[PDB]
Amino acid sequence: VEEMRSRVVLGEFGVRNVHTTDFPGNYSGYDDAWDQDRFEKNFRVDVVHMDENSLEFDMVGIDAAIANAFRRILLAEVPTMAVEKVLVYNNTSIVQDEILAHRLGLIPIHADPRLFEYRNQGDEEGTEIDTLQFRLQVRCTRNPHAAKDSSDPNELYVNHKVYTRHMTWIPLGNQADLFPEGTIRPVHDDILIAQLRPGQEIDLLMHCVKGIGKDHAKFSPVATASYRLLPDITLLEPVEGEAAEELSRCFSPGVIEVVARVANPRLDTFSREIFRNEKLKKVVRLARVRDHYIFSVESTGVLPPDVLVSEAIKVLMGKCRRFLDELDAV
Amino acid sequence: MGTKANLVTPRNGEPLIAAIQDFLTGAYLLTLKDTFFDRAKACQIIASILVGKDEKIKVRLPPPTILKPVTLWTGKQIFSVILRPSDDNPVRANLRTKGKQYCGKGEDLCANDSYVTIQNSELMSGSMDKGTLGSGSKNNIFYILLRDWGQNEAADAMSRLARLAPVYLSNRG
Amino acid sequence: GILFEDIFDVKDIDPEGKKFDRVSRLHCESESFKMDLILDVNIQIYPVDLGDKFRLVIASTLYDRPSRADQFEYVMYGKVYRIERLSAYVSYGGLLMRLQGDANNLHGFEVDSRVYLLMKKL
Amino acid sequence: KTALEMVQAAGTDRHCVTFVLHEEDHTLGNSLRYMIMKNPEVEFCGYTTTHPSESKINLRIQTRGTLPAVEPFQRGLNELMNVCQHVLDKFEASIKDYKDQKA
Amino acid sequence: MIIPVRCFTCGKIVGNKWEAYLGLLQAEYTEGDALDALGLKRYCCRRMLLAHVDLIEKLLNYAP
Amino acid sequence: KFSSRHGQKGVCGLIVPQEDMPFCDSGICPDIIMNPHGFPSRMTVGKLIELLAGKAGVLDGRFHYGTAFGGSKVKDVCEDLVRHGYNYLGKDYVTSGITGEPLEAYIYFGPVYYQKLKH
Ligand SMILES: [Zn+2]
């Protein structure tokens, strides 16, 4: 009689409706055969809470298959620049060479991609159109005004800790297009690379390349790029008389109002505490809307997150125009 | 000494090469009476079985077992695609047996549904236990496909299930 | 083209206790033919309750272009697979039907043949 | 040499082809599967990775009538590219509206 | 050894949150809400500071 | 070979990319997907509590003692997940990485101490 192919329903032991189930000739009476202007009208994007290094826009009105492209494309197919070859000179640190050279890899780099191109051949020399070199020269001694205390900031601290402030930029070529903080070493200047004791050196050049995130996860532009369907919670029965404040502490705190009203459902983490109550579990069905999700992009800081998403859509479109031109050849 | 020849141990005659662990609990959860797939998920689970000597067959999805209110397949109808994926496949497997947690009374009509009946490689009733898919029973299908239809069809239907049943289970969780 | 039809009264929604969340096995009785049937019905799409008169039609064919028999509102598709007062076991993928009794009106049935259900409430 | 079709038989059947899309994975397959399943003339669409070692998917399209197993595929991308054109513009019009509301 | 500069699961930049974390534990701050002050929401990035041991200040002693 | 601090050792059979892996709601994709068939024959229920005592442990900033014959019981660990908005058994609702639809059943989820060993 009534069709919730539009809500997944979360039981106590399983998640019930799950698969999309809306294609031609599945639900009789319903014509769902990809009307383009119907999708064009029922779709909007509602942005909530975009500061630096976060984004929580919505994208209401697409299936969870194309939404799992934009999560996946953000995660491992939007390119970034990261350190790939660490040309090492004298390095007398106690940190091992590869583990240093691996820890230089995970540092993000504020120079945005799509100014540069990929590295074509092996090409370990770089061509200043592909790469971006960095220098790291730290040699720590004792400071002369050190007191007798064993405080490592006070004594032994010329450069006891190799932060990413010590990395600098060797402009490879013209490199006048980018400005002074233009290639701000590691997006974060507080990252601890290694620790030293006096008489120890770290001297190394670096090479940065433009890499897909699926090649290696140090190229990943985003911390987490997950998404989640917007929940909607329907009290089938009116709840009042101290069972409302019982249902208040049952859910997430901000979600509810006190009679009982489901004030704001978007803030609900799925603890599923109702089924512990043994009385209200028959009262309210909890559900999540299928075509209304909540994206949550938090960039590492290479590109601002409103330009990560608009790049993520831009390379999915490029992935299908790459194939549509294959059929034009054939 | 090929695996397609030594499917059967020489102590009993039982088959030793048959599903283990997840494939059994994959295909039990798929052929369980409650599952229903729409043509979304049905063509997705089925089209997992199309690589590696299987990519050149016109895979025939069977007509769905619910038509009018919503149309959707059942789980056992997709397990029949393992035994006979194409149209021109000559396999007609037949098997009727008891199962684990057997209902005791009732031949095949009781609600516990632990009674397998395959007619012409179409799972008609019952759910696939270990005793109808695993190793040690002389009435699992891979033993029945061995004796009646050669040993190439038993190794294909066993290498179909190993490809199909994790693809269902990793999306059913 | 109809093989068999009558009005039925569902008497036990699930006889031995709910075993599945989407399928419950009905026990019904006919009107003046006295054909017992034990039918499984997907109840999530088509909920049924105790003591509910519902039509039931078994057809070999349904005759969107040929304009199907769609006055009914619950249509399955499966094959007969056993004939044992005859029982007549029909399987609908996994959903069993054990229409029974009085073999003169059951005459249209055979074994290994495709069979539609066309149910409807009343 | 990315996309390549697989003939069903030596005689050749256009009602069912098997597209092998190189160097890709579910990121496209599961989003193109959906946009080509919403076609009313496809009775079977589905994809599988051959192996996690190599990188390719095997999309298989089977139509109803005489669909050349290429015309839904060339319309699966064209509907998806029109989506990614639209969802981008609705995204950039909304960030530009959110930033201005914060000022 | 030393603090791994990423989370292993998500990859939040967490290597720059060690001496900022140790500066918090030097004060009154409890082990719990110290990581809520550094912006560590999920637990997988929270275990990279909580379950981490710092051998590198101890190895340095035996490395003249 | 990895072991799992309960004698359930295991060769690392497959290394999937991160984007093919069942992320939960808050974003946490797993590191080591463990098969659940190691449990009902081995009956290592002590592993199933480490995914609970660990997951409540990191969320509170606390190291839960599970010693022999004592330690932190389940009836007080489970009511610590509820304060941080988690399921009181630890089974968290995930959505699948490959297909994008949510998984049909909830997935147990948490940090347990995996020690690599010298094979
Ligand atoms: Zn993380």
Q: What CATH number corresponds to the domain at position B82?
A: 1.10.274.100
Say how many Å lie between the first and final Cα of chain A, rounded.
48
The dihedral sign for the CA sequence A98, A103, A109, A114:
positive
- DSSP-assigned beta bridge partners for residue A55: A297
Cβ contacts of B52 within 8 Å, gap of 6 or more:
D50
Tell which residue, A310, A64, A315, A71, has the closest CA to residue D89.
A310
Cα–Cα distance for residue pair F109/B41, rounded to 1 Å: 26
Dmax over CA atoms of chain D, in Å, equals 67
Beta carbons of B128 and B122 less than 8 angstroms apart: no
Nearest alpha-carbon partner for A293 in A71, A76, A27: A71
CB spacing of D94 vs A316 below 8 angstroms: no
The H helix count followed by the E strand count for chain C is 0, 9
Range of the domain at C86: 4-122
Establish if F79 touches chain A: CB-CB under 8 angstroms.
no
Q: According to CATH, what is the number of the domain A77-222?
A: 2.170.120.12
Q: C102 and chain B: CB distance < 8 Å anywhere?
A: no
Dihedral sign (CA C95, C100, C105, C107): positive
* Experimental approach: cryo-EM
> What would the two tokens of residue B172 be?
């059913």
Residues 6+ apart with CB under 8 A from B164: B45, B46, B48, B49, B81, B82
Angle at C82 between CA C77 and CA C87, to 5 degrees: 100
CA distance E26 to A158: 23
Chain D positions in Cβ-Cβ contact with residue B61 (cut-off 8 Å): 43-44
Is B17 among the domain residues?
no
CA closest to D19 among chain B residues: B55
Check if C78 contacts B (Cβ < 8 Å).
Answer: yes
For chain E, the domain total comes to 1
Bridge partners of residue A294, in order along the sequence = A228
C-alpha to C-alpha distances, A326 to A323, C59, D5, D28, F106, nearest whole angstrom: 5, 49, 11, 15, 42
Interface check C33 vs B, CB under 8 A: no
Residue B12, Cβ density class (10 Å: 0-12 exposed, 13-18 middle, ≥19 buried): exposed
Dist. CA E43 → ligand 1 center (Å): 8
Residues in chain E, overall count = 64
Per DSSP, the three-state class of A172 is coil
User: Would B149 be classed as within a structural domain?
Assistant: yes
Q: How far, rounded to the nearest angstrom, does the alpha carbon of residue A328 sit from its chain's CA centroid?
A: 36
End-to-end CA distance of chain E: 17
**Contacts with D30 from chain A: Cβ below 8 Å:** 65, 68-69
Residues A217 and A234: their CA atoms lie apart, in Å, by 41
Q: What is the dihedral of CA B47, B48, B52, B57, to 10 degrees?
A: -20
Phi first, then psi: what are they for A229, rounded to 5°?
-65, 140
Selected residue of B37, B65, B92, B101 to mutate for chain C interface (largest C Cβ count, 10 A): B65
Counted residue by residue, chain A has a size of 330
Q: Which of B67, B109, B122 sits opposite C38 (nearest CB)?
A: B109
Which residues neighbour A67 within 8 Å (Cβ) at sequence distance 6 or greater? A59, A227, A293, A295, F100
B143 assigned to some structural domain: yes
CA torsion sign, A147 to A149 to A152 to A154? negative
Query: Bridge-partner residues for B125, per DSSP?
Result: B117
Do residues B117 and B96 lie in contact, with contact meaning Cβ atoms separated by under 8 Å?
yes
> In chain A, how long is the greatest CA-to-CA distance?
86
Please tell me the distance from the alpha carbon of residue F62 to that of residue F65, in angstroms, as a whole number.
9
d(CA A80, CA A64): 26
Contact B112 C19 (CB under 8 A): yes
Question: What domain range includes position E51?
Answer: 1-64
Give a yes or no: residue B66 inside a domain: yes
- Choose, out of A23, A56, A73, A276, the residue to mutate when testing the contact with F (most F CBs < 10 Å): A276
**Which residue matches tokens 């696939």?**
B128
- Give kind and range of the element (H or E) at residue A294: strand A284-295
Residue type present at position A149: D
Report the neighbours of F using a cutoff of 3 or more CB pairs below 8 angstroms: A, B, D, E
Q: How far apart are CA A52 and CA B61, in angstroms?
A: 50
How many Å apart are CA C59 and CA A28, to the nearest integer?
20
Domain membership flag for residue B85:
yes
Angle formed at CA A225 by CA A223 and CA A229, multiple of 5 degrees: 145
Q: State the Cα angle at D47 between B121 and F14, rounded to 5°.
A: 95
Structural domains in chain B (count): 1
Tokens of A6: 């539009």
- Partners of B143 in the β-ladder: none
Deposited resolution, Å: 3.3
Beta-ladder partners of F92: F107
What range defines the domain where residue B144 resides? Answer: 23-172
The domain tally of chain C equals 1
| Encoded amino acid at B44, one letter | Q
Please state, in angstroms and rounded to a whole number, the distance separating the CA atoms of residues A326 and A323: 5
**Count of CB atoms within 10 A of residue A153's CB?**
11
d(CA A228, CA F26): 8
Give the bridge partners for C40, in sequence order.
C25
- Nearest Cα of chain F lies from the Cα of A252 at a distance, in angstroms, of 6
